[PDB]
Amino acid sequence: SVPWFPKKISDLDHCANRVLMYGSELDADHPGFKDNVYRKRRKYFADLAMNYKHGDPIPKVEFTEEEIKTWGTVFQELNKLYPTHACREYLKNLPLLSKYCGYREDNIPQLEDVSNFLKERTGFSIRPVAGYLSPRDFLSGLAFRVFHCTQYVRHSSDPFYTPEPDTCHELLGHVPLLAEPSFAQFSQEIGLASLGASEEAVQKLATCYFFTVEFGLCKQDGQLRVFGAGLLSSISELKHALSGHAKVKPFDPKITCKQECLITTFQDVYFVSESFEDAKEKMREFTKTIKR
Ligand SMILES: CCn1c(=O)[nH]c(=O)c2c1nc(Cc1cn3c(n1)CCCC3)n2Cc1ccccc1
């Protein structure tokens, strides 16, 4: 039979809290693992997300001086790399976020402001999320153009700690491309395909998502460019991905979905999409083979 899936945007209230691994439950190797103040701070963010309901304004947070310094460090270094690494759509939208959502090295943008910007541009919106959801639940948000977004900041001891998303990753990696209509349609269609899909199908869609939205490369005017959010918020891997040291294959959902998604290391392979439109077309053909 078909599993429950959300039928309208407010139904994400019933699956956005189905958190498998809560935001304050740190990994043993997390830089903040022995930091009680940071643990308390993470519980604060997790509770904001748990208490959030669709329709609410996303709670605005006063970030600490330390958190803002962490963001600034990350922001300054990445912005040196974006002109020579990021895809044209990313570079087109990033200055709009500086102008309208307060992206600055001494200011962390609020999720509510970014959500309002996205709603106007592509109809995307943000939902704060306490922690990790099943791939079924996470992808289901995209069906309604909702992106489940972490609100906390990485621990200050390691401004380059990358295996878990934080709000730096969300704001610098994901948001500029959600502001692009062709990328928003691509993303939404991943979510639509997942709704009520088999567990097998959901997993394959999640892997395709990983190797496009999170670690995708594209070809523009004959050059390799980056559009994956995980690359766009990782200083070292952003550089690695466009070096001669990286293994690169064409995006092809039936092949790409066999690839293991790595967590604590650079990816072993990156997949190059021809355009967001072509990636979208390829996903359309693939989803017909795994769902109906
Ligand atoms: C489809 C896979 N997938 C899933 O199944 N469930 C998710 O909840 C999920 C996800 N993917 C991402 C987003 C995400 C996860 N990551 C990154 N972005 C940047 C690189 C580090 C891992 N999230 C959001 C998330 C939020 C807090 C902790 C882990 C993951």
Ligand SMILES: [Fe+3]
């Ligand atoms: Fe991400």
